[PDB]
């Protein structure tokens, strides 16, 4: 009994004869690199990737964002070449490189990252954290314009929300300061929602901020359709993700069917869904900014529940499945004396009829 | 058969399961530890288009590690 292979065999392509004339893997690292680059090939047999959780990834995802800025790659490469040549012209830099002392203006390199290549890394971090899965239901977008949000807790120091920072409600007690570059002809909608934290519904979200028709950078002038509410991750719950989305609209759009009462301290009123919001306002705005952070229970959450939501605070607990034991045998042959201990409920003496 | 995901190996080469799940048999590329001298020299004696492709056993876990329940209302 034989069955022919359902496709090319892994080692059939290489020649079997004249194996002296074939170059050998002189090292371990080249074989390693060949093996890893072969591991992702679409093999016709059963493999690790076929079974271990890829959620059927290959399918085009819908891009909802600004088109990339048209650039002249020829002139840009020429300019970069002139810059590296200017760097080459200096010799103190070569001395530093050979003398193993060459630090970098990390501020400058980070700013250059934000201006040029920040959107791509931000988008991949967002998709890794599952923001597109949980907000746009799978659709992706590249945050073109960098956004800067920082929280105020004291007198001097930052507590910014980077691409995946971590802030407690103690540091998020009041609305943060938001900045971004805009022209004085464009209106903007800023939105902040928490992906994790919804008690009654396990797919909804809590709307923490909503500003509409921001006239450029005048964030103090945008109408407050939903006042700011600090985060409130549950006590025993895990760590939640809160995200700021930033959108731009071509024309002034105003809406009262979405507007909340002045206090709006009711979670049923603050039952929010990003996909429904985007479907009902699909045409007017377009996302361009994204930032997010993690939040875990601290002592400010309990007073938030005290006086803001006027509710009794919920606490959670990570439990585990009960341990597995086989069906108990009448004669547990060759089992230790403690076999009978895996099947009791209470470890206290019992006296049945006495 | 070589141990794969959530499959431990005992001192006598026996393969046991590390989680509760479903046994799966695959054929994965074999890359030995650089400490294993015999295997690394066997590797280095191969030409540029050779991979080993040994057989591996994995366990696909069936249940999550746990959940979060409401315990108190205070």
């Amino acid at each position: 009994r034989r069955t022919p292979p359902l496709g090319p065999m892994p080692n059939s392509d290489i020649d079997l004869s004249n194996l002296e004339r074939l170059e050998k893997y002189r090292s371990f690292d080249r074989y390693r690199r060949r093996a890893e680059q072969e591991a992702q090939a679409p093999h016709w047999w059963r493999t690790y990737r076929e079974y271990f959780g890829e959620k059927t990834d290959p399918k085009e995802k819908i891009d909802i964002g600004l088109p990339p800025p048209k650039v002249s790659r020829t002139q840009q490469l020429l300019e970069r070449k002139q810059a590296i040549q200017e760097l080459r012209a200096n010799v103190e830099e070569e001395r530093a490189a050979r003398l193993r002392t060459a630090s970098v203006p990390l501020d400058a390199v980070r700013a250059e990252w934000e201006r040029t290549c920040g959107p791509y890394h931000k988008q991949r971090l967002a998709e890794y954290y599952g923001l597109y899965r949980d907000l746009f239901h799978g659709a992706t977008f590249v945050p073109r314009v960098p956004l800067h949000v920082a929280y105020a807790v004291g007198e001097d120091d930052l507590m910014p929300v980077y691409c995946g920072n971590e802030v407690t409600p103690t540091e998020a007690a009041q609305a943060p300061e938001v900045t971004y570059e805009a022209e004085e002809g464009s209106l903007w909608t800023l939105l902040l929602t928490s992906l994790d934290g919804h008690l009654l519904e396990p797919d909804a979200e809590y709307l923490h901020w909503l500003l509409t028709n921001i006239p450029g950078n005048r964030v103090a002038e945008g109408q407050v359709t939903c006042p700011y509410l600090p985060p409130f991750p549950a006590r025993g719950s895990g760590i939640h993700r809160l995200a700021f989305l930033l959108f731009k609209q071509d024309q002034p759009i105003d809406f009262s069917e979405d507007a909340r009462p002045s206090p709006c301290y009711q979670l049923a009123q603050r039952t929010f869904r990003t996909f429904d919001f985007y479907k009902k306002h699909q045409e007017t705005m377009t996302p361009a900014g994204l930032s997010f952070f993690q939040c875990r229970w601290d002592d400010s959450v309990t007073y938030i529940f005290h006086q803001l939501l006027d509710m009794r605070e919920p606490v959670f607990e990570f439990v585990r499945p009960p341990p597995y034991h086989p069906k108990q045998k009448r004669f547990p042959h060759r089992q230790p004396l403690r076999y009978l201990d895996r099947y009791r409920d209470s470890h206290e003496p019992t006296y049945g009829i006495y | 058969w070589h141990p794969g995901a959530h499959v431990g190996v005992g001192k006598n080469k026996c393969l046991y399961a590390l989680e509760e799940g479903i046994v799966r048999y695959t054929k994965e590329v074999y890359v030995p530890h650089p400490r294993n001298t015999e295997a690394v020299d066997l590797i280095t004696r191969l030409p540029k288009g050779a991979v080993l492709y040994k057989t591996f056993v994995h366990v696909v876990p069936a249940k999550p590690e746990g959940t979060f329940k409401l315990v108190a209302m205070l």
Binding site: R2, L6, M9, P10, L16, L19 | L42, A50, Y53
Partner: peptide, 18 residues
């Protein structure tokens, strides 16, 4: 297995003549 299409996938001593 010997009756399967993927039989003989772990064949290497035909590659290493040594």
């Amino acid at each position: 297995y010997k009756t399967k299409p993927t039989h003989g996938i772990g064949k290497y001593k035909h590659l290493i003549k040594a």
